[model samples]
Target chain A: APLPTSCNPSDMSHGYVTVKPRVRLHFVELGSGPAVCLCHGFPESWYSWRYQIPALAQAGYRVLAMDMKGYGESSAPPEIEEYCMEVLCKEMVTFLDKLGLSQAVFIGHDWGGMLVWYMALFYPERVRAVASLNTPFIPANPNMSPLESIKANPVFDYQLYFQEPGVAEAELEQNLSRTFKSLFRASDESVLSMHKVCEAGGLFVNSPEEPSLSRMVTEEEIQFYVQQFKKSGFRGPLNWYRNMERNWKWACKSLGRKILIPALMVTAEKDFVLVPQMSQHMEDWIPHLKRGHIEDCGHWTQMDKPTEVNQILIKWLDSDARN
Target chain B: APLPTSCNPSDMSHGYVTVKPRVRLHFVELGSGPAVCLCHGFPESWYSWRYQIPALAQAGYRVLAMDMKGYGESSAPPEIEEYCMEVLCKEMVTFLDKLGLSQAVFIGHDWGGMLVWYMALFYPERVRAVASLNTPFIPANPNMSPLESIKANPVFDYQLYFQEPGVAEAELEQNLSRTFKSLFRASDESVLSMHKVCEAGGLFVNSPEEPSLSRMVTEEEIQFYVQQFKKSGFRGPLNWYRNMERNWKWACKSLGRKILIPALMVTAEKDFVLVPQMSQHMEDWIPHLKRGHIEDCGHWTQMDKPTEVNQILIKWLDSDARN
Candidate 1:
């Protein structure tokens, strides 16, 4: 079958709704049926799910890929306090309420993956099912903050680099093309090693001047990302990282609890930062869990292996998401 | 002989000299004789050495307390790369050369202590003797960067917090009085635990409101620091931290080398971060090292026990600094 017309960027409906006071979110809507809310992560927007959006929509599901709170056309607040998990989760619930979505299948990646898991835990009534790509559900550590755990691994220094406001923004916003090209890669190794990112001062400081685009994205897609980031800058996206401890604290309420609803975890074999082994114990917390593996893929799982990811997502949703 | 006239802030001579192109340093000049350059550390300026300056001058030494690069009335270049150890050490050398001084006995605390040690290693001929307060001589790790080593300690999260450019600046710069009052403490424990600083989102974010002034400093001294910081924001002072890896790589030149020149290690008994045990291996690195201890002092050693610190410094310099 041909790809859905909604796959075309021109066909997707762009709209904004005030999720909460001082918080308006922009989303791309396509194909109507049971709602499936797609949330993206750092240095990204709704466009990260371009491939997945059309596939899921074609599979007879309503697709709502949002720009998240701080990217694309969404309102970007200046204060770091505004980006905490409590604020973020509350906004998503309010967004659902505004859209008349009593429940929806929440799909997320990277930072968004962390967000969706929290939604399932914090607002379980509003989520029919949950799916994550390149990120696993790790139960909250009562003792340590998420930032402290990330700090424990020197390889995750890039996250630490993002904790600072304005620093990464200046480096990334210096050149939008280079930033997207350098970051949107399918290779297991990042454009720069995570350890070297902060050590070298920034993600793009030591990055190649004109890095080749990954096979996962085209020049047009890269340009779209550039345009989106140019509007959003990095402060809002980076603010998500600054709230690690706050998120950890807010997440404490769901501590020692398991996900009673259906859950899907798609692991990428070569995605080093979110290794396959990280999801090993998902069954313990997520009793109704379905696992999928994309071999020879990197961090950009959905984009890198759209067919594989789509097959897994659609198949799992059909069997599990009995709305 | 009540005290050197320079002890009075009104009598101290303020001057600026261009050490390198686009890099000018500000210094507080006192009684004239053999030069004794005082370099201070983070969230501080030439004023940190105010208590030590006049005392050194009273002991028959020319005192030159400088606001190291980014603090007080010095050239605070906006780039993090500009604050690397190589640039800082070279700038100090050029500042001395511009003033027609061949070499000077260097006394430093905190970040300045690190700079002076680097000066001795990179330009031994420009340093007659070296003394450090709180901070001890840490040998460069050939494999790991200074940042990597620091990341290994959970308590050093404040250093990691400082790695971000404008985040901490905004937090600290929000209220200058609160920042100093919260930080300038004589208590054995920090106002906020080192681990809690970043966890709380900032050093001052969770810091006590209207914290009492430490006995080490008076309202007048606190106001002086506030004025100096007002002139130079936290960006420059924090930039020093952003160069750990760069400094580590630059410091590789002195790998496994001992400090052949006379050196003094002043340890504060109560400083948890830079405990006395941290300086235990100083003998291995500094062959001609003299060790001194202040029985009940904190991170602010010179300010906490000025009389003891002065006695230790003057006595050591009188015997070790043979011109």
Candidate 2:
């Protein structure tokens, strides 16, 4: 019958987002001003900035958060090229262009942040101003960081393992829901405990399969995740990792590009997913930058610390740069 | 194939302890004095407790650490009931009984901790003292606290996740060694991070099948684990989680038989697998307990903090009757 009460989020959230392909990208518009578009990142959907939506709308801007190609409620393309930062950047510009808008203020985080940076580099004029949470784009990744650089930070050595041909496809095809649960919030101590596993190596190595990080994950969340994943296998998200090289090559062609947009990036001090290095090269690449840090948060900034994030984003957007 | 350095608790480790009908239990004895038995938990064979083995032995106590059934070098019984805590406690007591020792020190960690608690309950007369790492046996479980409870002490929740019908079996079958990388660990932090995945949900939920957790794992360690887990599917390990209800029922039989043994339990302060409440209500059921806590540790406390754990065990063994 109905999902057990234990399965629901305490908020009892139901969204209008529908999957055109792999996921149902959630979208909403508050008051209309200049369109403010937010693109989500790997391991997240437009849900990443659930906090920013109302604030942007309340400020009289048309705020739109689209699930990236493979995230939340959005179209998922199996081909790796479709998820490349350039491809997704193209999707962002096209999405705005579809609405018959020439320019918009864009926001992003992690891969989303990276895409926003790419959007400025690839189509500078389309981005009036850009704000990123946790990632800033570089025209060329000359520093050996990305190789040492990984997707979604290093808590998951699985990406490094998945880079080998056919690795992730097999691991995930076997169990879609557990795979998602593996990524969900297992416990209060999950981040702290995971910090060790990530430092030691990760889910693999001595680990044959990950142990239970927390006592219980609700079945509703699991089903929400499973149903979405069943729509598209890992090819869509894995494509993001697969596209680093492609994005590298494409961005390399435009080495002269600079992030002219007024950009802001926030780093969560304890986030293992984008630890230490994600913000490393931002100053060199994006000239106009505003930076801040979250005291206790992880990769999924908005969802992880919704109220704190809401405060941060509101404060940042209200800054003079937005005007 | 010769075991590699990357293996879990190398050398002392005999991966997946073999168990048969009255089979010769492969065991190692260290030190000499009062007889004490050390048992390992899920995802670990006896190797999980290697750190304490030598120390306890050195402290003048005969230490016997056995890889619980369905663990390293252990038999893989398809019958899930055979893995029930009752059956396991029976095995431990019979093991102690058969050795001609009337009573012995009972100690364990992770699943092993749960085992030792049950050991004291099922065969109270045979336990001279009781000790556990990361888990405590209690009579009442607060219903609203599954999240906190499991987060703080995952071995139980993990056992629950482990019992899901085809979770590990399918992962192992898909990529045997890769699965090991998913499961095993040495350092406590790394071990706990992977452990958090199930409690959180999926290790790679945002992008199932992308091998996100691998970003935290390594190729060498993955290879090391994959080779060993290839021997059998996850049926053996998962049976432990499946036996919870059965284990619970079995414990109920001991209503009049609470753990009267002198107890010593240890908790990893930064451990991801189990959390802060590991010792909640411990005194209610355990009767006599000397508890210890280690900072910056995970599920593999013995391996992660071998020296400290060894020191703790030695001191605990010598301590006068807090009993």
Candidate 3:
């Protein structure tokens, strides 16, 4: 139960992502050296990477934990374009410039995972090394030319329902916690430890309210997520789905780009986002990549298995970053 | 790929289980001699036994596929009490009495399989030998009495919903082919096959709007299904659910009565509705029970894998059913 820090609401700006100006990103810093930039995913905020931020700083890297756009402590943009990869890609790179760091080792998981891949491809020079916990880059670099379509994950057709104007946001708004719970297997004992059971706990369809971690979280952390999201709701995060068309165009610009920097990508064994065939081509995408896997871990690899993650991240950085 | 014959609707009134003045018990009779009585599960019909009718008949067993009260060509009683286990149990027993047969081999899958166990129990003398597929008669049978309310299955809920007056028939009217396409998954290529695939279908929340057939069936067969379902609607079949209270009472009467007949129960390895654990108590319920397993078969054990099913049925009969 770490005390949370609030985001600098005064720094809020519409910037490159299509989200409203009121939408903001939260950041927390501790010990510093070479900056280590990380982003969070759905149902989470900058706080998700709390374990990593401190660990990375202790490893002598200036650690930056971001409340990803549309998540806790960030704006929920109005249009799909606001959440698009192109927009968020520019914003994170801008974050680097704003923080006076020319380049950093960038890492992400879940939604944050996809963001990091786009960041590496879009602004290769601004990134020293790259890593992701579970989410794959989704074809990492575009093939041929962007096919000009909204290609999404195969089984998650429901997630796409959110991008179509009123339907998704309304569903989330009507029942926040229930919707969040619905996504977890019903037998889930706790968030920190995802135990798969027959009951299938997270059935968003029957969900009624958001999971309140009021007592579990510090005052500052709770306010950070609620205050920012209340400004615009979850539209900005959900809008990310809307940007596939724009993302397709932006990705087309990176066709044939290869990962030149030292890169580390770890796939959580228990994560059930896409099929395993999704990450089979990692070696082909990044020539300098070293890949690893964690068993009995899920989407939140850093949080759920922080002790193991600490060992993996430090070992990789110490070995490669020194070179 | 065989041209599915038009379901020859039939059934004779027996003194023991008659539902009043009607001389008919909702059923379909195909082939002739040594009648093999068939019963289907929820969200299905006598047509589900289409392959078996011909196969069993060709093997010299009179094939009788009964829609079992509350389904096609049968009287749909409004009361759930009538659908009680005692009612169906009596209906089958009297069906044999009315047919002038001393006893016939009973074959059922899904809910029908449940009835077969009860049929063997009440009319042990009339049932020379029982052959059950998919649904297994629990060993303890009544299963801790009231605790086993038998309310776990989704079909029963639909029955309650259907009893509420106009839910399912409307769904069928709106989407017929799409409905069946989504509802059914047979054990094999033919509707009566004994082999199964992993994607064993679910009928709990079955939608009636799916395409009737895919590459699996021909235009003629699809039309045949569409016409039959459309003509009968769903009242006659749905009434089975309406009889649960009576069934519980009826089932209660025979809680301690062991099935005294020579019995052979086959649980499909791939059957979704009926699992191996369900029959765990079968030995306790039947004094002389033989249990076996069919590979790669699902709820549509009779239809999906016809060839293997025919072999199992013919071999079982040859081995045991005799004067």
Worst 10 residues of 2 chain A by lDDT: A3-12
Which tens-of-lDDT digit does each residue in B1-323 have in candidate 2?
Answer: 12112223332312111123543244544344576777876666565554566656556665566756765455667788877776777666555433335677777877788888777776777777788888766663424333465456545454455556787466445755434554454443243334454756544232223232433245664554455456545687677777555655555565655666678878888665567484776776666777788876655676556667776777887773222
Best prediction by lDDT = 1
- lDDT to native, each model: 0.79, 0.59, 0.60
- lDDT (tens digit, per residue) of candidate 3 on B1-323: 44333333222111112434442355544343454688888767677776666667666565567766766555656554656677667767656643335567788777787788777877767766788877777633354543244445532333334454456556545555665655554534223211222122222232333334644345555555567667556655565655554565666775557877778888777664466667887787677877677777666676566666777777776566533
What lDDT does candidate 2 reach at residue A100?
35
RMSD of 3: 28.9
TM-score of 1: 0.49
lDDT of 1 by residue, A1-323 (tens): 33222244543445456765687887776544567899988778888787788778678676778889989889999889889989988988877654445688999999999899989887789999999987899988897777578878777888888887888888888888878888788875367767667668677766679888776677988888887877768788889889877777777877778888999888899888888898999899998898889888888776677777788888888888845
Model 3, A1-323: lDDT tens digits are 34323233322111122122454454544333455777777766676565665566567665556768767545555666677887787777655543334577788777888888878877888888888777765553355333322233343544445456766566556544444443432123333212222123222433334554423334454455445455567677777766666777677776787777888888777666533446778887788888778766655565556666777887788777634
| Model 1: how far residue B42 lies from native, Å | 0.9
lDDT of 2 by residue, A14-72 (tens): 22222223323334333334567777776655544546665565655655656567654
Colliding pairs, model 1: none
Query: Against the true two-chain complex, what DockQ does each candidate achieve?
Result: 0.00, 0.01, 0.00
- lDDT (Cα, 0-100) at A12 in candidate 3: 19
Residue A86, model 3: lDDT of 75
- Prediction 2 TM-score vs. true: 0.42
* Backbone N/Cα/C clashes per model: 0, 86, 66
Give the TM-scores of the predictions, in the order they appear: 0.49, 0.42, 0.42
DockQ of 1: 0.00
Candidate 1 chain A: 10-residue stretch with minimal lDDT: A1-10
